[PDB]
Amino acid sequence: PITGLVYDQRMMLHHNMWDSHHPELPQRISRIFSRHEELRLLSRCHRIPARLATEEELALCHSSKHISIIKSSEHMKPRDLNRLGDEYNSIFISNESYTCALLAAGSCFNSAQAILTGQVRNAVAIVRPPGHHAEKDTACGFCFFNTAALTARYAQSITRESLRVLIVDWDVHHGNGTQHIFEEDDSVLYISLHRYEDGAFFPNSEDANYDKVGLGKGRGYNVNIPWNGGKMGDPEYMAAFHHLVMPIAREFAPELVLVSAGFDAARGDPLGGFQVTPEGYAHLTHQLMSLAAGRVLIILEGGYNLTSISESMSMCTSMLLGDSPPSLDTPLKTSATVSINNVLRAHAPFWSSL
Numbered sequence: 001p002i003t004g005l006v007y008d009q010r011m012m013l014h015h016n017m018w019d020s021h022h023p024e025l026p027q028r029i030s031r032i033f034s035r036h037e038e039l040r041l042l043s044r045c046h047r048i049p050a051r052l053a054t055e056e057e058l059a060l061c062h063s064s065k066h067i068s069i070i071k072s073s074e075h076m077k078p079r080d081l082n083r084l085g086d087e088y089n090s091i092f093i094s095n096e097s098y099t100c101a102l103l104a105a106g107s108c109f110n111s112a113q114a115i116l117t118g119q120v121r122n123a124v125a126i127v128r129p130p131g132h133h134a135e136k137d138t139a140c141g142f143c144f145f146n147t148a149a150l151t152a153r154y155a156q157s158i159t160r161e162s163l164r165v166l167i168v169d170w171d172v173h174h175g176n177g178t179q180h181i182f183e184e185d186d187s188v189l190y191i192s193l194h195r196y197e198d199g200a201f202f203p204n205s206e207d208a209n210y211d212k213v214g215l216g217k218g219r220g221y222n223v224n225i226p227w228n229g230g231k232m233g234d235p236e237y238m239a240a241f242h243h244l245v246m247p248i249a250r251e252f253a254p255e256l257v258l259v260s261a262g263f264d265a266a267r268g269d270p271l272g273g274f275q276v277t278p279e280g281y282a283h284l285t286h287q288l289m290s291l292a293a294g295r296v297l298i299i300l301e302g303g304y305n306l307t308s309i310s311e312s313m314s315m316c317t318s319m320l321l322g323d324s325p326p327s328l329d330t331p332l333k334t335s336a337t338v339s340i341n342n343v344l345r346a347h348a349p350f351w352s353s354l
């Protein structure tokens with residue numbers, strides 16, 4: 001009954017060499033790690049080693065062009081790093097970025113392998129840079145390679161090709177790259193909750209709306225839960241899990257759960273504007289633990305208030321370790337009722353549980 005934990009200080013080497021205060025900070029991961037130490041969660045976990053992803057593994061989801069361009073940045077002079085970063089939507093690059101992206105993905109592969117070999121029941125991955133905005137062919141939104149999507153394909157590569165992987169993306173932003181990578185796929189169920197604001201919120205695409213349900217054999221296996229016009233928090237997220245996430249997930253019957261666990265919907269985040277609490281994140285984690293015989297891998301995505309992400313992800317690890325769910329302190333914001341009902345209208349044709 002072991003919980004794994006992967007953390008490697010070398011992932012702090014990725015940095016913004018022009019803006020030391022850019023919110024995707026190296027100390028995001030060291031702060032989360034430190035809070036696990038203070039709460040004495042670290043010694044209750046088995047340490048899973050980091051490793052570099054291989055180029056062959058990156059090619060599970062990304063084009064060889066994209067791999068080669070990010071790879072080339074390791075030897076790039078500052079002016080060229082600045083210019084290359086500016087060719088993407090919201091990317092900064094340093095000479096260490098490629099290696100850190102490789103480390104984040106490989107750390108998650110090792111964690112998924114530890115779960116799927118029965119060496120640990122579940123695991124938490126304290127990694128950066130994040131992944132869920134990265135597309136097959138391009139970097140986006142602080143993300144170079146799509147760690148969670150690659151981990152889903154990696155898991156299938158060591159088990160069977162059609163292994164049912166659920167990805168729950170509770171980062172406040174839509175994971176455009178994860179949706180696109182699996183949009184035609186019925187073996188990977190993508191469920192995202194995100195601030196949407198009728199397409200005005202990053203990443204600024206109507207691809208994130210509730211009516212994008214998947215394509216081809218993937219029709220029904222893409223679930224977007226978009227928030228509009230309100231400061232959403234625990235009641236809205238609990239209601240979305242109750243009416244949507246958990247009924248769909250149970251019907252899908254995943255063999256592995258990956259959480260694209262951004263903590264930028266947390267109270268205090270400078271970018272998300274929401275107010276999910278650490279206790280809320282613990283309850284979402286505990287609900288997901290009922291799936292896939294407990295095989296849950298929690299993967300850090302966004303989240304930019306250092307205190308908020310440290311308390312929030314530590315509470316998630318406490319849940320993985322088997323601790324009792326904390327006590328939770330309200331009627332939904334009206335637009336959140338509308339959002340949930342819109343998703344129910346979009347997906348009840350595909351899911352008998354709805």
Ligand SMILES: [K+]
Nearest residue numbers: 169171173193
């Ligand atoms: K999301």
Ligand SMILES: [K+]
Nearest residue numbers: 182185188221
């Ligand atoms: K899908």
Ligand SMILES: [Zn+2]
Nearest residue numbers: 171172173302
């Ligand atoms: Zn985010």
